[PDB]
Design a protein around this ligand. Structure first.
Ligand SMILES: [Mg+2]
Ligand SMILES: [Mg+2]
Ligand SMILES: [Mg+2]
Ligand SMILES: [Mg+2]
Ligand SMILES: [Mg+2]
Ligand SMILES: [Mg+2]
Ligand SMILES: [Mg+2]
Ligand SMILES: [Mg+2]
Ligand SMILES: [Mg+2]
Ligand SMILES: [Mg+2]
Ligand SMILES: [Mg+2]
Ligand SMILES: [Mg+2]
Ligand SMILES: [Mg+2]
Ligand SMILES: [Mg+2]
Ligand SMILES: [Mg+2]
Ligand SMILES: [Mg+2]
Ligand SMILES: [Mg+2]
Ligand SMILES: [Mg+2]
Ligand SMILES: [Mg+2]
Ligand SMILES: [Zn+2]
Ligand SMILES: [Zn+2]
Lengths: 169, 77, 117, 292, 49, 86, 55, 190
RNA sequence: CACGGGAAACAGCAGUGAUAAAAAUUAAGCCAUGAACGAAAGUUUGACUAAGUUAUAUUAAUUAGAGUUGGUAAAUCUCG
RNA sequence: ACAGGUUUGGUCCUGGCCUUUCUAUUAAUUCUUAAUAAAAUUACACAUGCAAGUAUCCGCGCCCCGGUGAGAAUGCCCU
């Protein structure tokens, strides 16, 4: 787009390139940050940039931002078990915040790979049906098998009218 | 087809089903083969029920499942 | 859709083309239409012979045995196919049909011999 | 303890033997093309990009495993005399499951005679392609693999395409795979066309086929005429490895030759065109020292 | 005896883990006993346990 | 249209001038040639060893037209028609 | 399902009570229910004919 | 067409060089239509019997251009040298009949190695090659298989007892049929 | 809604009136699928299958007619 | 949209309408054979035929299939 300070962050590619996936126990991320002082430049840049990337890959996690109540910027992760994860961000940078969050509460590369390997199993290559869920519609189009009657007409010996005609006489 | 509230046809109201021809020597061996086949398929059904039980138990409280349930808890702390 | 009852049945759904049948071996509810909603697809069945001349049939034995242990009923042609595959014992209907065919060949050769002299 | 194609002592020689040619590995093919990307780098970043390209070329040069001919499948599971003529065609049954390898699938065929046998290799491979299609494979036998079209494509020096198509289509332990690869390897040393596979991923296979078939006369002279002596000493080392008991191998041990002299003992003892090999080595010797 | 393909399934299953025992696998019929069609059924309500 | 087309075509920047003005190598990355570092122009003169500031988030002037084209939202029937050759 | 504008249907539930009462009050006694005409093998109550193998 | 056997002879001839030269046969052809945007579907077939329908097609106005798999020079003009895709009918200008024939000929010449195309590097199908599994190796035969006995004892036809036959015949009176003994083992032909 | 009140029900397959610019056979079977029943041989299924009719649409050909010719936009000579 | 026609003595800008592309119905003209897919005006009323049977009685199923889009902003996805 054109409107906005950074039009790039409002694109599907930017939202998809941010790889931060929370665990199933993660429910709430409450970020508290200030709008003044040189200490909180990293927290402000984190709120400006990385919140959309985290939100895109965690749609069910509620993220709430708060401004100018606590003098120290921090994050509070509310889990399913009730444990509150307190993350102090005073001089951390924008990339350091993301790396710290992924370290403390996130999903490993192998964990993501096993989920996607399970997901690709649902679509099965040998199944038949519509093009949305299956690769083949009718089994005629397979090379070695009988062609589709709407493309190559079948011989008179395989048509049902000739079989009825021969039985009639 | 037909529904519960529609009356039957007149030509079939005065009609009863007629059983077909019966061959005794074929029918007896056919029935003993039915019983011998049904006992085998029943045993296979029991075998499949047992294997499903084993797989579901190993998926819920399996030796591999408990290992994950413990290592995740350790890494969390 | 909502049903009052019924049972899970592994059957054949005729999804194909005119004068060119093709069955999908699928596990579906008993009260649903033949080509309607199903639970999970298992395999394929090809009624016509291909160029090489084999009748090609697919079975997903693992899911089939899983569902049958779960309580899936079976249809008669599915039983014939499974018995031919070797996963299940041969259906007696095939045996009695083979014996009937044997008797038809015997009477055919008898009449052919008697009509020639 | 027979040496194997996947052994380290063979693979380390074969990698250096093939060599690295980026302009050939990363070549513009005939696929759909997109506008390029431009970014500005320093000298160190350019060198890092080049070494990353080399590491990618390693994966591009990943060698295909060459295997022996597989044993034909001939076994009967059951025999039902009742089904002698109830069916005209035969029923082929495939076991389909994503969690099982394709080497463990049960492909069982009921003959019209009434027996249940295991499907042979050509039927099994065809059924795997039918129910698990991968790009580059054809269910039916392609016409291109015939001896007329194969010669036609050879005349247009497309042996790299021949080898890639054969690898994609056939299974390395099948019969036609080995037959066609031996046919291309006999054409390549009949015509001296080793240039096509100089830097591809199929050079090691051809070299390992020649060390098996004792056909080195053309390869050695080609490597010498291409000013490659590190690619000749390693080749004769492969020959000695795979033929330990031989007059060429034992003479090297008894004499203690250097890399340059390892070729002379081979070309005197067991080489067939020894005169040409010696003449080529003499021509290289009288020129390399004088020019450099 | 098991059906041919199913029996071969177990013969391949244990061979992968390395069971060298070549014993012939049987299928039990102890719990496969069924009543004939002439056996009448009960008409009382079934108690869910 | 002609005046603007000629002005824009004349105000182009050659890879050689880009390399001259930024003292860095211009490397082309073809999609077909994989990760191969194809070099198109060399920065003749003093080659700076200091690398360019890598922007984690680029501040570029994007356009909703090309964003729609990239996201596949161009459902107009006038975009993917078959037309005559050059 | 559950909406804000769900109408409180009362006749549909009153019909349930009416049919429940009529099921017990007008319960067909098994005597006339299983009565049988021995000439036509025709059940006077339900309206079904007997199978021919039971003739 | 005088050749009738060797299509590339015309392409190598001089009457092709003086007429078309180094340019493709469809370079000078311009399609007439109703607006500025041509229809997505070109003419179906322009040569109906002996009549030519108005302005003919680039390969199709001259009878010395034979569409075939042997003349790679003619087929190369309709295949892009860079992208390797077949140009469509609105791109070239031929009637749809010659377009389908061109596509079929291009594919059939590709399947013979005369016309080049992309050959990607495809990994082997199997990660691990193991023939020792029971799927491809022989299995130990069954005791009933080695003896010649069917798989299950009830597969064969056994003669029913006379008492049970009489019991069946008593209950199924009026519905009786002719008896049949053991069936023949082998089916004779016609 | 369906106790009850209007009131005698094709929003099943075919077909008939009115209406509308809108026009398929008042035909054959369960041989093969799905469903129901019966322990079962087996029965039924206007679902379904095999068909009849329709340029509504794609393909092969046994076939040649329609539109247009001022610009957009390919293409006109002579008459009133 | 790769656009084009169209305001004015005339130019530029703004701005609407139309044309060029694809699909579905009806109408007109014409029309030869096959294959495949689909048959689409009506929740207006129906003459007539068939569409729920099975079975040693009990029982089981009897808008299940199939038909339609009137009402509902109804609803999609998820515990
Ligand atoms: Mg149909
Ligand atoms: Mg009844
Ligand atoms: Mg109502
Ligand atoms: Mg009505
Ligand atoms: Mg009704
Ligand atoms: Mg009707
Ligand atoms: Mg009417
Ligand atoms: Mg109509
Ligand atoms: Mg009419
Ligand atoms: Mg009419
Ligand atoms: Mg009928
Ligand atoms: Mg049926
Ligand atoms: Mg039946
Ligand atoms: Mg049409
Ligand atoms: Mg005039
Ligand atoms: Mg004005
Ligand atoms: Mg009409
Ligand atoms: Mg419906
Ligand atoms: Mg309303
Ligand atoms: Zn089809
Ligand atoms: Zn033409």
């Amino acid at each position: 787009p054109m409107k906005g300070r950074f039009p790039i962050r409002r694109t599907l590619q930017y939202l998809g390139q941010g790889d931060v996936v929370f665990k199933d126990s993660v429910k709430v991320m409450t970020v508290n940050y200030n709008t003044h002082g040189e200490l909180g430049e990293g927290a402000r840049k984190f709120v400006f940039f990385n919140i959309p990337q985290i939100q895109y890959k965690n749609p069910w996690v509620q993220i709430t931002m708060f401004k100018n109540m606590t003098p120290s910027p921090f994050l509070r992760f509310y889990l399913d078990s009730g444990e509150q994860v307190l993350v102090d961000v005073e001089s951390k940078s924008n990339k350091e915040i993301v790396e710290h969050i992924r370290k403390i509460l996130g999903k490993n590369e192998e964990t993501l790979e096993k989920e996607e390997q399970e997901k690709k199993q649902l679509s099965h290559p040998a199944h038949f049906g519509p093009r949305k869920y299956c690769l083949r519609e009718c089994m005629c189009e397979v090379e070695g098998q009988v062609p589709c009657p709407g493309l190559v007409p079948l011989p008179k010996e395989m048509t049902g009218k000739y079989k009825a005609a021969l039985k009639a006489t | 087809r037909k529904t519960r509230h529609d009356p039957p046809a007149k030509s079939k109201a005065g009609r009863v089903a007629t059983p077909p021809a019966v061959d005794p020597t074929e029918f007896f061996v056919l029935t003993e083969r039915y019983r011998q086949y049904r006992q085998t398929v029943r045993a296979l059904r029991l075998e499949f029920m047992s294997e499903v039980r084993k797989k579901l138990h190993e998926a819920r409280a399996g030796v591999q499942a408990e290992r994950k349930a413990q290592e995740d808890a350790a890494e969390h702390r | 859709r909502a049903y009052r009852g019924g049972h899970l049945t592994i059957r054949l759904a005729l999804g194909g083309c005119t004068n060119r049948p093709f069955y999908r071996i699928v596990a579906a509810h008993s009260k649903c239409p033949r080509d309607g909603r199903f639970v999970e697809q298992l395999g394929s069945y090809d009624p016509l012979p291909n160029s090489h001349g084999e009748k090609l049939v697919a079975l997903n034995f693992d899911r089939i045995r899983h569902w049958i242990g779960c309580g899936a009923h079976l249809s008669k042609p599915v039983e014939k196919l499974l018995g031919l595959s070797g996963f299940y014992p041969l259906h007696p209907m095939m045996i009695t049909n083979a014996e009937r065919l044997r008797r038809k060949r015997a009477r055919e050769v008898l009449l052919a011999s008697q009509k020639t002299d | 303890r027979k040496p194997t194609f996947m052994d380290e002592e063979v693979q380390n020689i074969l990698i250096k033997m093939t060599g690295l040619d980026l302009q050939k590995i990363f070549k513009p093919a005939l696929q759909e093309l997109k506008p390029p990307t431009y970014k500005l780098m320093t000298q160190a970043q350019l060198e890092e990009a080049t070494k990353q390209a080399v590491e990618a070329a390693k994966v591009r040069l990943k060698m295909p495993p060459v295997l022996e001919e597989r044993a034909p499948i001939n076994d009967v599971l059951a025999e039902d005399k009742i089904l002698e003529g109830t069916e005209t065609a035969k029923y082929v049954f495939t076991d389909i499951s994503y969690s099982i390898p394709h080497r463990e699938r049960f492909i069982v065929v009921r003959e019209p005679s009434g027996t249940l046998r295991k499907a042979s290799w050509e039927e099994r491979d065809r059924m795997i392609q039918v129910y698990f299609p991968r790009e580059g494979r054809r269910i039916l036998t392609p016409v291109i693999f015939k001896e007329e079209n194969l010669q036609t494509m050879y005349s247009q020096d497309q042996h790299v395409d021949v080898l890639n198509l054969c690898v994609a289509q056939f299974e390395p332990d099948s019969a036609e795979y080995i037959k066609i690869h031996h046919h291309t390897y006999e054409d390549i040393d009949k015509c001296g066309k080793y240039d096509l596979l100089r830097s591809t991923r199929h050079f090691g296979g051809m070299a390992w086929y020649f060390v098996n078939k004792k056909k080195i006369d053309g390869l050695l002279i080609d490597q010498i005429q291409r000013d490659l002596v590190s690619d000749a000493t390693s080749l004769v080392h492969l020959y000695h490895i795979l033929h330990p008991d031989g007059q060429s191998a034992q003479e090297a041990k008894k004499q203690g030759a250097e890399g340059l002299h390892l070729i002379k003992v081979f070309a005197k003892t067991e080489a067939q065109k020894g005169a040409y090999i010696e003449l080529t080595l003499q021509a290289y010797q009288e020129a390399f020292i004088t020019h450099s | 005896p098991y059906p041919p393909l199913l029996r071969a399934m177990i013969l391949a299953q244990r061979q992968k883990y390395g069971d060298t025992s070549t014993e012939e696998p049987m299928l039990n019929l102890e719990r496969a006993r069924i009543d004939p069609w002439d056996y009448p059924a009960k008409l009382e309500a079934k108690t869910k346990t | 249209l002609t005046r603007g087309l000629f002005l824009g075509l004349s105000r182009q920047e050659t890879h050689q001038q880009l390399a001259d003005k930024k003292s860095l190598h211009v490397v082309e990355f073809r999609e077909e040639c994989g990760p191969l570092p194809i070099v198109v122009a060399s920065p003749q003169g003093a080659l700076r060893k200091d690398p360019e500031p890598e922007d984690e988030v680029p501040d570029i002037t994007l356009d909703w037209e090309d964003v729609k084209a990239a996201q596949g939202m161009k459902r107009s029937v006038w975009s993917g028609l078959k037309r005559a050759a050059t | 399902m559950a909406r804000k504008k769900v109408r409180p249907r009362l006749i549909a539930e009153l019909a349930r009570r009416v049919r429940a009462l009529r099921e017990q009050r007008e319960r067909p006694r098994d005597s006339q229910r299983y009565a049988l005409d021995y000439e036509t093998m025709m059940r006077p109550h339900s309206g079904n004919r007997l199978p021919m193998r039971a003739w | 067409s005088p050749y009738k056997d060797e299509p590339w002879k015309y392409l190598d001839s001089e009457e092709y060089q003086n007429r078309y030269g180094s340019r493709p046969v469809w370079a000078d052809y311009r399609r007439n239509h109703k607006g500025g945007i041509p229809p997505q579907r070109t003419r179906k077939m322009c040569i109906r019997g002996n009549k030519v329908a108005g302005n003919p097609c680039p390969i199709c106005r001259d009878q010395k251009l034979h569409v075939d798999f042997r003349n790679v020079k003619l087929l190369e003009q309709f295949v892009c040298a860079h992208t390797g895709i077949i140009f469509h009918a609105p791109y070239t200008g031929v009637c749809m009949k010659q377009h389908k024939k061109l596509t079929q000929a291009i594919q059939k010449a590709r399947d013979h190695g005369l016309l080049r195309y992309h050959i990607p590097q495809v990994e082997p199908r199997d990660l691990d090659f193991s023939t020792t599994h029971g799927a491809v190796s022989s299995t130990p035969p069954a005791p009933t298989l080695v003896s010649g006995d069917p798989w299950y004892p009830w597969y064969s036809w056994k003669q029913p007892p006379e008492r049970e036959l009489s019991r069946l015949r008593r209950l199924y009176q009026g519905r009786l049929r002719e008896e049949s003994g053991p069936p023949p083992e082998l089916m004779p032909e016609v």
